[PDB]
Amino acid sequence: PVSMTKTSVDCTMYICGDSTECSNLLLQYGSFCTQLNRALTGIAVEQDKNTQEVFAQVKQIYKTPPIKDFGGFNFSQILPDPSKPSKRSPIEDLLFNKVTLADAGFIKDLICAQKFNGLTVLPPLLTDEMIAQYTSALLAGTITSGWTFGAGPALQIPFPMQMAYRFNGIGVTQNVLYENQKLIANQFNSAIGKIQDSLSSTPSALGKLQDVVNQNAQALNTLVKQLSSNFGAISSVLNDILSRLDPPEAEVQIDRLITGRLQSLQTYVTQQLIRAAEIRASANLAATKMSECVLGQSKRVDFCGKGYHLMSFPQSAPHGVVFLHVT
Amino acid sequence: LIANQFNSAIGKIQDSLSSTPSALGKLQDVVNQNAQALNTLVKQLSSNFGAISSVLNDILSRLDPPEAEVQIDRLITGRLQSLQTYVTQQLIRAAEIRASANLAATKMSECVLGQSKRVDFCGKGYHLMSFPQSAPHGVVFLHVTYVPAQEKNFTTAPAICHDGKAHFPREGVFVSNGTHWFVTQRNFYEPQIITTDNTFVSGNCDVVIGIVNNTVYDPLQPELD
Amino acid sequence: WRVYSTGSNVFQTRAGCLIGAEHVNNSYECDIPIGAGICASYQTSQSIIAYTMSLGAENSVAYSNNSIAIPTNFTISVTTEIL
Numbered sequence: 001p002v003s004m005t006k007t008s009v010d011c012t013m014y015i016c017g018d019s020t021e022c023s024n025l026l027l028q029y030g031s032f033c034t035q036l037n038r039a040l041t042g043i044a045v046e047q048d049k050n051t052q053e054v055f056a057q058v059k060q061i062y063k064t065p066p067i068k069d070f071g072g073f074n075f076s077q078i079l080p081d082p083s084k085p086s087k088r089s090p091i092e093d094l095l096f097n098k099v100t101l102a103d104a105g106f107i108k109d110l111i112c113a114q115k116f117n118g119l120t121v122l123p124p125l126l127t128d129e130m131i132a133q134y135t136s137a138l139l140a141g142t143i144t145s146g147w148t149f150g151a152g153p154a155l156q157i158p159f160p161m162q163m164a165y166r167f168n169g170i171g172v173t174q175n176v177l178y179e180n181q182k183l184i185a186n187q188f189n190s191a192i193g194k195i196q197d198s199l200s201s202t203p204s205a206l207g208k209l210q211d212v213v214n215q216n217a218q219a220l221n222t223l224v225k226q227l228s229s230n231f232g233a234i235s236s237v238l239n240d241i242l243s244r245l246d247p248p249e250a251e252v253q254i255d256r257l258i259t260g261r262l263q264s265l266q267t268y269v270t271q272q273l274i275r276a277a278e279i280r281a282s283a284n285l286a287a288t289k290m291s292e293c294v295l296g297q298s299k300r301v302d303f304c305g306k307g308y309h310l311m312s313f314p315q316s317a318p319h320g321v322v323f324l325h326v327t
Numbered sequence: 328l329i330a331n332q333f334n335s336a337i338g339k340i341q342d343s344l345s346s347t348p349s350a351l352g353k354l355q356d357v358v359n360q361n362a363q364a365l366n367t368l369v370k371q372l373s374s375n376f377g378a379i380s381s382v383l384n385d386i387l388s389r390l391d392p393p394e395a396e397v398q399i400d401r402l403i404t405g406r407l408q409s410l411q412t413y414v415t416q417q418l419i420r421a422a423e424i425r426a427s428a429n430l431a432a433t434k435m436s437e438c439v440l441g442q443s444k445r446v447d448f449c450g451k452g453y454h455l456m457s458f459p460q461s462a463p464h465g466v467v468f469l470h471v472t473y474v475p476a477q478e479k480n481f482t483t484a485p486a487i488c489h490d491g492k493a494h495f496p497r498e499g500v501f502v503s504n505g506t507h508w509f510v511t512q513r514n515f516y517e518p519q520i521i522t523t524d525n526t527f528v529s530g531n532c533d534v535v536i537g538i539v540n541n542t543v544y545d546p547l548q549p550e551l552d
Numbered sequence: 553w554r555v556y557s558t559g560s561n562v563f564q565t566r567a568g569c570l571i572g573a574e575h576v577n578n579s580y581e582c583d584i585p586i587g588a589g590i591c592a593s594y595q596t597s598q599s600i601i602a603y604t605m606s607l608g609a610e611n612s613v614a615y616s617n618n619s620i621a622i623p624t625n626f627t628i629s630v631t632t633e634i635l
């Protein structure tokens with residue numbers, strides 16, 4: 001995972017929905033809602049910072065040459081396809097179809113009910129078509145320049161010679177590769193096809209992403225349920241209390257409602273803060289993996305997949321990243 | 328040359344920090360956040376939370392304690408809940424600072440006391456060394472790194488056939504001006520003549536894709552002949 | 553207030569719509585993030601302009617199957633990092 005969905009909560013619409021007397025009683029509680037709004041906009045900034053940290057690793061956009069004479073290898077499943085409006089790999093299309101996202105919030109469900117009570121969804125800073133541009137640029141740089149573009153200017157180098165360098169990094173003499181090129185090419189292409197159909201057949205692979213969305217969805221959902229509890233007053237609808245009692249004794253009921261709703265809102269925000277810290281930790285892990293397993297050749301055991309690491313390829317997913325380790 | 332580049336680079340660090348004001352924001356915001364949070368706590372004393380007034384000595388000097396109990400209880404609830412919120416937020420920020428401190432300790436152990444080989448862990452480029460300096464509640468690393476930048480192009484081949492046998496570089500790569508062939512290390516252009524003592528032989532030259540025909544000079548033969 | 557709702561430079565983005573900024577055809581790096589790839593800045597005779605953010609310079613590397621690039625000269629670099 002890299003980021004979660006940015007959420008903004010407006011107090012005065014949530015608590016005292018269109019009631020001047022309710023808000024005038026609310027300002028006796030001081031400056032709570034400024035603190036709550038500040039915490040939420042802090043999380044909302046931090047999400048954009050996380051995505052910028054993971055993907056904006058280089059500052060130039062390379063492109064692959066059109067000719068595909070890569071010495072027998074076949075990168076047709078991770079290279080971009082010009083046949084679609086979304087310039088993706090087919091593997092990225094499998095990733096975009098496996099996750100059933102929610103929370104559309106279109107410009108005019110449960111989503112509209114969430115909209116009607118001060119809960120808004122801010123759209124992300126990076127769209128779905130720039131993340132693809134970074135990922136395709138990293139693919140282009142890796143397959144045409146080795147690791148030299150991770151340290152300075154891009155230096156072109158033929159691909160099987162790069163693979164000879166990468167066996168020499170393991171501890172194998174490079175003449176192993178040049179005498180067995182076709183076997184390695186066939187194993188690589190078969191393995192890539194196995195990734196494709198294995199991900200296509202298994203439904204339960206991407207749960208690490210999905211649960212995150214679900215948790216946020218579930219948390220937001222239970223917030224709306226807290227509008228329907230009366231907290232010990234005679235009713236839970238504020239307009240009822242304003243349309244039945246005089247204000248000098250309706251202060252008693254309204255104060256109880258303010259207390260209950262404010263406490264529930266505080267609980268929600270604390271839980272979202274802790275989840276934000278967790279997602280930030282995983283994002284720093286992802287940034288370290290992108291720096292080391294992709295842009296270089298790590299030698300730490302089991303950091304870049306199981307076995308002796310050769311290279312990696314990144315791919316994008318909605319709110320996350322997917323690494324292919326070649327080992 | 329390297330001495331001059333190093334001294335000029337250090338001077339550029341000096342005047343770059345001296346001219347740019349917005350460098351140390353990663354430190355400053357931390358202090359600001361704590362300052363801001365603490366300031367908020369003080370002005371939570373001034374809200375009445377639904378009572379008569381926010382000054383306690385007013386209520387003690389206006390009411391008898393059978394009703395001062397009712398008013399004071401509301402004040403106690405409000406202030407205690409605000410203080411709780413402050414403590415929880417400070418706990419979360421403390422966990423964040425501890426994570427950054429463990430990152431700083433890892434960088435101090437690896438990028439300074441040794442020579443790391445992880446890419447982009449100790450600055451951009453191949454890492455040479457580091458130097459630490461202190462900062463108010465923080466640390467500042469100067470990474471000294473090596474960046475190669477003047478490229479030129481050559482035409483290669485994966486191996487050389489000489490006598491029905493393949494020859495491979497013991498370390499480096501075969502390059503060609505267009506007429507001759509040389510062995511070069513992978514990060515600095517320097518031609519050396521293809522001999523036996525920087526190559527090795529393995530198999531025959533009927534298998535490897537793209538092997539080119541040339542000759543390999545023997546260091547023993549003109550001494551013997 | 554109503555002194556800005558007159559407009560005549562109104563621009564509809566994926567986040568909503570923007571009033572008081574003039575949409576351009578260039579692509580610059582981001583200054584103030586608005587969202588959905590749109591950023592805004594204060595530049596030139598001075599006003600607030602909004603744009604699609606620019607990811608970086610486009611580049612192409614001359615790949616071949618028998619061509620290599622090698623460096624000849626080098627540079628020592630010193631960078632700072634604050635924690």
Ligand SMILES: *[C@@H]1O[C@H](CO)[C@@H](O[C@@H]2O[C@H](CO)[C@@H](O)[C@H](O)[C@H]2NC(C)=O)[C@H](O)[C@H]1NC(C)=O
Pocket residue numbers: 068073074075076
């Ligand atoms: C790389 O592998 C892909 C696998 O998709 C190859 O594409 C297939 O090519 C055959 C040959 O005509 C077609 O019958 C298939 O329909 C293609 N697959 C798809 C999904 O359309 C591609 O040819 C390979 N490229 C190289 C250079 O080997």
Ligand SMILES: *[C@@H]1O[C@H](CO)[C@@H](O[C@@H]2O[C@H](CO)[C@@H](O)[C@H](O)[C@H]2NC(C)=O)[C@H](O)[C@H]1NC(C)=O
Pocket residue numbers: 331332625626
């Ligand atoms: C390798 O790079 C260094 C530094 O870029 C070059 O040294 C420069 O040489 C020119 C000669 O006209 C001087 O004007 C500069 O002052 C030198 N730089 C420094 C920092 O003193 C060196 O010439 C380059 N090597 C080659 C073969 O060109």
Ligand SMILES: *[C@@H]1O[C@H](CO)[C@@H](O)[C@H](O)[C@H]1NC(C)=O
Pocket residue numbers: 069071536537617618
């Ligand atoms: C390199 O590509 C050219 C394409 O014109 C081809 O003729 C040649 O055989 C290739 N050589 C190698 C070693 O792949």
